[PDB]
Design a protein around this ligand. Structure first.
Ligand SMILES: CC(=O)N[C@H]1[C@@H](OP(=O)(O)OP(=O)(O)OC[C@H]2O[C@@H](n3ccc(=O)[nH]c3=O)[C@H](O)[C@@H]2O)O[C@H](CO)[C@@H](O)[C@@H]1O
Ligand SMILES: CC(=O)N[C@H]1[C@@H](OP(=O)(O)OP(=O)(O)OC[C@H]2O[C@@H](n3ccc(=O)[nH]c3=O)[C@H](O)[C@@H]2O)O[C@H](CO)[C@@H](O)[C@@H]1O
Ligand SMILES: CC(=O)N[C@H]1[C@@H](OP(=O)(O)OP(=O)(O)OC[C@H]2O[C@@H](n3ccc(=O)[nH]c3=O)[C@H](O)[C@@H]2O)O[C@H](CO)[C@@H](O)[C@@H]1O
Ligand SMILES: [Cl-]
Ligand SMILES: [Cl-]
Ligand SMILES: [Cl-]
Ligand SMILES: [Cl-]
Ligand SMILES: [Cl-]
Ligand SMILES: [Cl-]
Ligand SMILES: [Cl-]
Ligand SMILES: [Cl-]
Ligand SMILES: [Cl-]
Ligand SMILES: [Cl-]
Ligand SMILES: [Mg+2]
Ligand SMILES: [Mn+2]
Ligand SMILES: [Mn+2]
Ligand SMILES: [Mn+2]
Ligand SMILES: [Mn+2]
Ligand SMILES: [Mn+2]
Ligand SMILES: [Mn+2]
Ligand SMILES: [Mn+2]
Lengths: 316, 314, 310
């Protein structure tokens, strides 16, 4: 049994993929103690990506899917079924591991009996920032969702204990183009107790290059996961987690400032209708846990009142 | 010889503390024989302590015990009103104190000015202010002398006004019923006096749906609009508008909309507020201070989001 | 056929009317090339105004209406019927012309085949953007801020008015001047701006209104000049901005107006704007986004709030 399976979906990466693969093959961890599983989402780039992957045959595991699934969910699911390792680690095909990543995160996980180990993110190139608050206290052996700001760091680019994923049948959902990764991490968090944060190096380097129907169905599943948590079973604790998530959603959600945007009126109405429908399935008891500057915006969404959202946004 | 003044004092589980309040009444500059203290005990159950105190003034006070606890001052004060045949009554709460000159100074001033109502300045151990800023006022006015801001019943009232108009404390509300008594009295009389030479009444400080509260507020507006004294309809609008301003400034839970109250309770509160103000003619709104323009409209529209916004813009 | 008819409605002006009439009669333009048409709206000032007009017997054309119409519309329509000139110029009876006004505006119009010539306004006592660039031979409604200078105190080519039967509306005591100018603009192509002097000196001492505004949007959307649907959206949206910036009772919502009157006003406003395509909304200045939506939604509270945030 391997200590770690790195699961990397690929799609039309071509020759750029060498760099990412090299970052995985040059780990300080013993080569026999881990594997890289590459799942190619039926690249169509005149054989370029597949030709790159074939240069590592015998050093990696590899499967190609019959048709392109359109995002990381199915390829990542395919990888989970292939791994019988202790931990998995999701790596995107454009990012880079620090050479110490697998060894340090695994060791720290083992030491602290962690279900989830989060390594500090670095960045290559201007663009999207990476989470910062989660890493501001240094290393944390047993982290808290709320105190360590985990709802602001919900990518799957982390080390997850495989047995939690297996026992709880946790899979990536395939019906939405956005927030699926948040849902997977939340489902994991709600079924596990022990989370660790490792900050000694920048272990994972992020490289930078709708009507809301599907999106708000995904958000609905996040709230459902919280309210069914077997770990966080106290009802008031669920309200608190749900309120903290609502705060995160209002702070960083898709099209968060749609109301005063250049979106067509008809599209605003449909967007807000979906948003309102989803939030109205969340108990109002969670609302007292939302940061209070958002009190009006949140009520306006509940009331499905576009004028009131517009006004709330002018006052924020 | 009818008494000049009946002091009406409800009691409930005061204990030894009560001596001080009784003594403040029994030591007056007014001739002892010209006033009486009527004590109505609201079924104390403090191991006989309150009753033992009252028993020490047997023969110096009139006393009635109620056989079940009413739960507030209304039923005891009404009992007191039935018992008094005096020219004026004065409501004293069982934890407060009268200045030794209170009955004589207020009664004499009332007699000199043919006053229906005399208001003595309040002091505090551990109260309204604008009403008392102008010195003594022989013939005061509700709006000009800020009387809507001093509506407690801890005042001297002419008994004939209470009797003729059958004015009683309501017992359907645990809040604002005192304001209603004073409003009903003001709406049925003309001559009000303010006396400030001394802190005549000393307040001792110690360490919901809206259904009843707003039922009481409803009765205040109905008193104004049915006044046999203030009969002119524009004067009614002015008084109602001035009351509305007082309510928005100092009313219960005035900032409910952005508060920590549960949503269902906000909706019930505002439904109550909205339906009550919507019975008040919009002609009164021009008399409300302009800063409240949006908040008052939002309340009339029964629109919680608008009330939230109005409060954020204030 | 005269070059210019100056059309001047009068009503209870009195002795001060002398100063105005002589500003017309002392033009640099050849005396026989222009005419002053005075239309008295049945003055009732004990003959004072009439007595002034009478002194110019033989130097002006004059018609008195049998009854006071209440405003300039009917008298101006009367003036239009009486004039067979190349151009008309509307002059209010309390205002003044610069001696160079008719000559300079006409020559500039003739030079540039203008349908409309706008002279720079001056003031006596206690629109600007249109004049800030100096003379413009062929102006653009949007770029030269014409929607902000919609008075009829300008030189208009008579044939345009005749051929399109353009008349002042009598059923609105407000905004009828705007509608005239807009109907003219939407049925003509060549507009000129002249700025060498302050040519025209202004002296300073909802059912019908929104019916008029409705006609403004209809004039734009049925324009035989501006036939492209997107251009029509652009013009409508720019007009919406002008309406929100300078419209009658623009701040009605937080005003001392009776609630019932606020509701009726907004209801008319809402009804009118909801006949205007939402495609026009993107061309409205972004600060008005909330106010404009509040009006479309017929939501008085939202209009009150919108005003407080402007
Ligand atoms: C800043 C941010 O929000 N980043 C997120 C974004 O990254 P980002 O926008 O960089 O997504 P990438 O392009 O890196 O794609 C993510 C992974 O999906 C694979 N892929 C892509 C297309 C396809 O049809 N099939 C397929 O398997 C890629 O090869 C890659 O391994 O989306 C990723 C996928 O949810 C998340 O992990 C990242 O956290
Ligand atoms: C700052 C303020 O808002 N003060 C008011 C408040 O005073 P406060 O909160 O101090 O009320 P008190 O405790 O004085 O009680 C009022 C009177 O009611 C009596 N009592 C109490 C309980 C009971 O079951 N039965 C009974 O008769 C008390 O003995 C006392 O005589 O409420 C009083 C009663 O409306 C008003 O007169 C005061 O103006
Ligand atoms: C600053 C401003 O917005 N000024 C406008 C305002 O001028 P203002 O408010 O100054 O109106 P005036 O007093 O100039 O009257 C306009 C003209 O109408 C005539 N009149 C008046 C009363 C009457 O019953 N019948 C009649 O024909 C006047 O004599 C005058 O010739 O209204 C005029 C007519 O809409 C517009 O041309 C002006 O641009
Ligand atoms: Cl993250
Ligand atoms: Cl999101
Ligand atoms: Cl005395
Ligand atoms: Cl008064
Ligand atoms: Cl008081
Ligand atoms: Cl209540
Ligand atoms: Cl009256
Ligand atoms: Cl109150
Ligand atoms: Cl007043
Ligand atoms: Cl206007
Ligand atoms: Mg004595
Ligand atoms: Mn990436
Ligand atoms: Mn990329
Ligand atoms: Mn609303
Ligand atoms: Mn008390
Ligand atoms: Mn007390
Ligand atoms: Mn004028
Ligand atoms: Mn004038």
């Amino acid at each position: 049994m391997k200590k770690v399976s790195v699961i990397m979906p690929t799609f039309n990466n071509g020759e750029k993929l060498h760099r990412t693969i090299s970052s995985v093959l040059n780990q300080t961890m013993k080569s026999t103690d881990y594997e890289l599983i590459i799942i190619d989402d039926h690249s169509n780039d005149n054989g370029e990506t597949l030709n790159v992957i074939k240069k590592y045959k015998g050093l990696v595991r590899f499967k190609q899917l019959k048709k392109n699934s359109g995002n990381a969910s199915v390829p990542r699911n395919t990888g989970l079924k292939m791994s019988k390792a202790e931990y998995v680690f999701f790596l995107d095909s454009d990012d880079l591991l620090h050479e110490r990543a697998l060894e340090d995160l695994y060791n720290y996980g083992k030491e602290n009996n962690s279900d989830l180990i989060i390594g500090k993110y670095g960045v290559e190139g201007k663009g999207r920032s990476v989470p910062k608050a989660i890493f501001e206290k240094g290393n944390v052996a047993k982290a808290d969702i709320i105190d360590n700001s985990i709802f602001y760091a919900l990518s799957v680019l982390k080390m997850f204990k495989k047995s939690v994923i297996d026992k709880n049948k946790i899979k990536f959902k395939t019906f939405s183009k956005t927030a699926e990764d948040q849902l997977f991490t939340i489902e994991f968090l709600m079924n596990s107790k022990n989370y660790s944060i490792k900050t000694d190096y920048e272990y994972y380097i992020v490289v930078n290059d709708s009507t809301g129907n599907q999106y708000f169905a995904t958000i609905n599943e996040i709230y459902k996961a919280i309210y069914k948590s077997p770990i966080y079973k106290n009802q008031e604790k669920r309200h608190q987690l749900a309120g903290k998530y609502t705060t995160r959603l209002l702070r960083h959600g898709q099209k968060k400032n749609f109301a005063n945007s250049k979106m067509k009126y008809e599209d605003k109405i449909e967007w807000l209708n979906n948003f309102s429908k989803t939030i109205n399935k969340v108990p109002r008891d969670s609302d007292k846990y939302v940061t209070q500057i958002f009190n009006l915006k949140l009520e306006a969404i509940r009331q499905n009142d576009l004028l009131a959202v517009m006004i709330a946004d002018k006052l924020l």
